[PDB]
Ligand binder design. Structure first.
Ligand SMILES: [Ca+2]
Ligand SMILES: [Ca+2]
Ligand SMILES: [Mg+2]
Ligand SMILES: [Mg+2]
Lengths: 707, 694
């Protein structure tokens, strides 16, 4: 076996990707104009992937060596597995996305809206199924090879390496895996995010110096919401599972009591081992459920409403997972012992209640993102309508909106944390994070749908293929845009929940051989009353604000550098001949190290200067600040965009376009775009990677710091 | 001898106010010059009247509540503080709205710019000297009456009141005093701040004598009374926190030695440590008086920035020196200072005060750095105007988000070093040193509006260009020193709030902890899910609060746009109406969450609030000042070919209108939120440590 059965799920997911690829690839594209536009963007995507991958390779090697020297070789391998695993997923989804777009638009005419959705969604699913299969294939490998074969799940005492750096082997191994996933996420957001909006600015910046720099912007849409959103969600997914494993693993040395000079493990090996393996199996059942959710919607009789379709896959994947999960939990944790001490209030079933809380939190966090972002509800409506009072008002109201929009989703996270932890303690928080993300394949599938449609729509526009064809196309895109704001919203929620599990992980990972005496409560402690901790927290909040400010300026730097590649193309051409991607792609990368140094090196520097408490502080400031700003920037940016739309759909009598309010709404959307698509999504990654790195380096700086 | 000597300093400060008032009042004002002044002076009174009455109604309710749930002394202390800060604002405003006319006339009658500075600064000083004298007069009273006479500084143990609510009496008493100062600051910012920007918007939303006068009174409401009440609350907050930590150090450092309780830090030590910060602040006020008087009496200058600055530097150098003697001699043979956290014995906390002083100055520099055309960030913003309004907004948001790091790094280093010298007590003394010399800090603040009105009053009257030159210059300097001022007041609010957080945790010690190790009782564990949730809740409340205030400003402005004391009263009334809500958030959040979920969660909430509020306060101050000064930059003539009209200028105008509510309403309100939420929590944790629901 029953267990191998589970362990081969990721393989079917991967083959399933391979099949959806096939079945889409065998779909056709129409006109030479339809093919030509696709290749523009498809080649455009490859160029960017090429340059980015090479940069990723260079950093991954250096990190791998470093891990191998300072921790253990297993950890460095695990790191590479994760880097290869997430890398692979992005590379596959993008290849799909940039080929499915043409075949959506042709679906919209050759077929005649439902069978165009059936195409788009099959495409979207290649990114989602690859995200699940790869991420879980990797963890299965690490569990099987380093955990079982090499016995890291059999020993799991506190190991001390050739430099006297001490850690629990498996905990450390999977921490490396997580770092691998993080680094490709970081590159995809802080690098690809700059590119994407650098393109959008540049395109949206014409004084007459179609088809000028549109293709860069069109690739951006895939870079951002296929690859970027996918890497983001992947990291949070692995982060949640890895954290469950790290807390479980360390529970072994924590729950020992000396009795007559024996060390008695109050939570025993069987329990720890099950608790380590459980989240993997939990996530596997999820993938199986998500495959059923995805396949169902593809094979299903078609609809006229693609939102309901996309949603049927989501709801289906989640109902399914809740049900099977409760059996998995009862049967898998039926007789373990020490679950009381472990934090399980209702014995065995406890963490399932936690997973469920996370699931519902995720969905609610989705609803809130829609609520604050969709004309259709009040906040955006109001924003939209205030346009008649001017650009200042539009800006001030949008800032006001997003600042307020932070409360409902956060209350939802607060209640989720409280309840998660009521059922199953800190382990329960991480399992809730995992439940929140348990149907990640389907979540990611609906995300990737957005750009496929967006390109499909634009391709219709560039080609000017009919109006009747264009109607289905605009609708598909319209739905992309809603599901995309829900998507960003859900991915910020999951980033916060994952980061908070990784913070629990950071503290658990500090247990030393010399603590095995002490009470759990003296070892599982970060005291906020400590000045180092207060300082840490302040430093981390400010670093997060800096990071965000820097990324805005980065986007505007790169855009402008492109305009000039345009300007030198248009100064070159019109004089003689009437009237890229790599350039801005290269500058996006160049202007990335700096953010990446902040993300990766901040724990290291502050850790080696001031130690584990201060870094504990830093991680807390970072998550608190980052959680809030991520939400503010998503919502403000979304609201501003959908407000512009609102008037464009003619919901303000007598204004509908190039009018003074429309202009004011355009200016808000231009301020908003870098916030929603670059700042917020980068912060998701910052609040995670900074934690993973810390989890690993606290091996060294608990003991070896300067002051 | 030195006892009463020190305790009468606040009285001299107050007489000194009364003298600067007199010597200004005797200064003269044209009919146009008088008429405009009265418009704005009457305008100010109208607003003060409506606000005070509102304050009164809330302060009575809070006082009876304090008397029922804690002790009557606490309620009295609360009222003393409310009366004390209230009084200061009323005095500084009366002065401001009369000094303005006599600056402008100075600029012509007296015929030059240095003796107009001498007027303006004398005016400014009434607000500053009143702030110090009142705040300290109060604390002296509480120390003398409740501490000494009624023996609260003699008795010192853990008292349990008629409802079984337990607390250390003096700690609790001064916590009330702090709440009083907080309430009037809250009203002055979250109420007066909405008025001031409601007025600015409305005026800037009607391009053609509008009841702009409202906007001119706003300038006083905001930077005389509001900045003043803000700084006052941080000042008292820092002193009170020093006292709270000291007081609780008594039950904290007890060893259970074979069924006796042995106080490892003894009454003499505690009592000095309670009294020390008061005396420290008193020496400061004395020094600030010398700083203020020196600059007034001084031979005049051509440069009023140097003047204002001479008073600051003079007040601070002076304080550093005398303070060292005060510290050595007052704590020299004290005992148990080791256990208290004093790394270098007696002198230790002086090193802490010094760190705070320098932090304050640096935090000032940063504010200027991110806000003044003259330096790179604002220059760049200004020159990006040629690329559009979007760019101006994005670059300004980008500027302020970045501008947070240097001043925060300054706080981080300050906290680390404060605590290295003298522990958590040292952090609070750092906050106090930062804010020692507060009279002179507040004097330079109040100078700004006095000049601003002074300038405007020249512009409305049309009195010469040569006269107008001195005027514009005076105002020009006001605007720089105001940005430094905001910047310093945010720094002090954070340092205060962090002390009050320390105070919040100290205040939870129970009779049943008097055995336990300090380290098991002075603990808020971040690994606890309640604490994590708390922090997230508090950070979200803070963002909400800020959002709500933006919207409040635009609501009231618009209310004005639809149509001079009535017009001031209408929007003044709505400003108050639209205040309860923020005030509920500030005051009631600890109570609701405390009674639901307890002390740890609220500990969380407070941490989120401070961290989030500190960052947003800085962002908004700097981005707002940047935008303003970038508009100015082009207005002085700096891109070339563009000026006071033109598409970039328009774009800079739009950024300044987005900025104005952020720098003058959101940020300064956040200073208060991060403080009052703590003071309230310090007090109500008496009850909800024990009595909460889940
Ligand atoms: Ca947009
Ligand atoms: Ca302004
Ligand atoms: Mg597009
Ligand atoms: Mg004015």
């Amino acid at each position: 076996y029953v267990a191998a059965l589970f362990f081969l799920i990721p393989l079917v997911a991967l083959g399933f990707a391979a099949a959806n690829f096939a079945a889409v690839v065998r779909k056709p594209e129409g006109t030479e104009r339809m093919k030509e536009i696709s290749s523009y963007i498809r080649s455009g995507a490859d160029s960017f992937l090429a340059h980015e991958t090479k940069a990723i390779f260079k950093v991954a090697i250096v990190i791998a060596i470093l891990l191998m020297i300072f921790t253990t070789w297993q950890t460095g391998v695990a790191f590479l597995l994760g880097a290869v695993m997430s890398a692979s997923a992005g590379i596959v989804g993008m290849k799909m996305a940039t080929r499915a777009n043409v075949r959506v638009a042709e679906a919209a005419r050759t077929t005649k809206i439902g069978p165009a959705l059936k195409v788009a969604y099959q495409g979207g699913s290649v990114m989602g199924l690859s995200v699940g299969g790869f991420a879980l294939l990797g963890l299965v490998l690490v569990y099987l090879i380093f955990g079982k074969w090499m016995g890291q799940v059999d020993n799991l005492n506190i190991y001390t390496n050739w430099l006297g750096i001490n850690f629990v082997p498996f905990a450390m191994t999977v921490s490396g895996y997580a770092l691998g996933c993080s680094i490709i996420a970081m590159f995809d957001r802080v690098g690809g995010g700059v590119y994407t909006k650098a393109a959008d600015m540049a395109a949206d910046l014409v004084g007459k110096t179609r088809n000028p720099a549109t293709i860069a912007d069109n690739v951006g849409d895939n870079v951002g919401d296929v690859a970027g959103l996918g890497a983001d969600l992947l990291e949070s997914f692995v982060g949640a599972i890895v954290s469950s494993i790290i807390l479980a693993s360390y529970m072994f040395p924590i729950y020992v009591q000396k009795i007559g000079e024996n060390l008695v493990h109050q939570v025993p090996k069987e329990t720890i081992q099950a608790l380590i393996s459980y989240p993997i199996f939990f996530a596997l059942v999820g993938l199986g459920c998500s495959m059923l959710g995805i396949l169902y919607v593809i094979v299903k009789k078609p609809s006229d409403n693609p939102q309901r379709e996309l949603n049927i896959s989501l709801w289906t994947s989640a109902l399914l997972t809740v049900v099977l999960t409760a059996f998995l939990t009862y049967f898998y944790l039926k007789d373990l012992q020490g679950l009381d001490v472990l934090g399980f209030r209702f014995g065995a079933i406890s963490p399932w209640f936690s997973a469920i809380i996370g699931i519902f939190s995720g969905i609610l966090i989705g609803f809130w993102a829609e609520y604050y972002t969709s004309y259709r509800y009040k906040p955006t409506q109001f924003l939209g309508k205030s346009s008649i009072e001017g650009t200042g008002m539009v800006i001030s109201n949008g800032l006001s909106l997003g600042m307020k929009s932070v409360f409902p989703p956060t209350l939802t996270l607060v209640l989720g944390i409280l309840f998660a932890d009521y059922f199953a303690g800190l382990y329960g928080v991480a399992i809730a994070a995992l439940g929140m993300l348990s149907f990640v394949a389907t979540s990611v599938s609906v995300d990737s749908y957005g750009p496929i449609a967006d390109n499909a729509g634009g391709i219709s526009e560039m080609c000017e293929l009919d109006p009747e064809v264009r109607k289905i196309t605009d609708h598909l895109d319209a739905v992309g845009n809603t599901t995309a704001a829900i998507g960003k919203g859900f991915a910020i929620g999951s980033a916060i929940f994952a980061a908070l599990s990784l913070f629990a992980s950071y503290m658990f990972s500090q247990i030393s051989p010399s603590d095995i005496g002490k009470p759990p409560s003296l070892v599982l402690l970060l005291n906020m009353l400590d000045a180092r901790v207060i300082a840490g927290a302040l430093l981390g909040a400010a670093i997060t604000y800096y990071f965000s400010g820097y990324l805005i300026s980065a986007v505007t730097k790169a855009a402008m550098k492109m305009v000039d590649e345009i300007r030198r193309q248009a100064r070159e051409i019109p004089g003689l001949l009437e009237g890229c991607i790599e350039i801005t792609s290269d500058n996006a990368l160049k202007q990335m190290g700096y953010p990446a140094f902040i993300a990766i090196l901040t724990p290291l520097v502050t850790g080696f200067l001031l130690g584990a408490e201060f870094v504990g502080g830093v991680l807390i400031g970072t998550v608190l600040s980052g959680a809030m700003l991520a939400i503010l920037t998503a919502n403000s940016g979304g609201a501003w965009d959908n407000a512009k739309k609102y008037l464009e759909a003619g919901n303000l009598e007598g204004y509908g376009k190039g009018s003074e309010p429309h202009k004011a709404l355009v200016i808000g959307d231009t301020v908003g775009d870098p916030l929603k698509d670059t700042v917020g999504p980068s912060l998701d990654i910052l609040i995670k990677i900074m934690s993973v790195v810390s989890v690993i380096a606290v091996s060294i700086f608990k003991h070896v710091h300067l002051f």
